[PDB]
Amino acid sequence: VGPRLSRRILQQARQQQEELEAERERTTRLGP
């Protein structure tokens, strides 16, 4: 394929994997 198009394909497939895996405040205190 070549560098640029394969790079776009790889990142696109990675984003599709993450959106398949997808389907609160920070811990402000140390002790409960």
Binding site: V1, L5, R8, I9, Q12, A13, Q15, Q16, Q17, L20
Partner: protein, 125 residues
């Protein structure tokens, strides 16, 4: 069980994920039958019409498409769906159906499974 394939055109890329399902086709989260240019609608719909809706009745696919223009995106999508079905019937279904289906696609159109390696030429000083 699921597979993930890709198809391409000049710059347009389509990544297709193929999972066990019931026969709903998603491209960019949108259904197959609503992609903007209707004049190329059958160009989007050729694998289903050649193979029949009964071969798609036990599977679902989602395609993310990036790059290119309208027509290049359509061609990358149809390459992606054809390669996704070929990969699925190769990996989790018996090989004879995969070979006969691959023969049907390649006798109708080579670009359904083989990428067209044409791109814009560069201009040199």
């Amino acid at each position: 069980q699921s597979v993930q394939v890709f198809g391409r055109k000049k710059t347009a890329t389509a990544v297709a994920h193929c999972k066990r399902g019931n026969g709903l086709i998603k491209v960019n989260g949108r259904p197959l039958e609503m992609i903007e240019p209707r004049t190329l609608q059958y160009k989007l719909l050729e694998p289903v019409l050649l193979l029949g809706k009964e071969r798609f009745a036990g599977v679902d696919i989602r395609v993310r498409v990036k790059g290119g223009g309208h027509v290049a995106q359509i061609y990358a999508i149809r390459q992606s769906i054809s390669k996704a079905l070929v990969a699925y019937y190769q990996k989790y279904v018996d090989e004879a159906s995969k070979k006969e289906i691959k023969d049907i696609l390649i006798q109708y159109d080579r670009t359904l499974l083989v990428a067209d390696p044409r791109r814009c030429e560069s201009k040199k000083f």
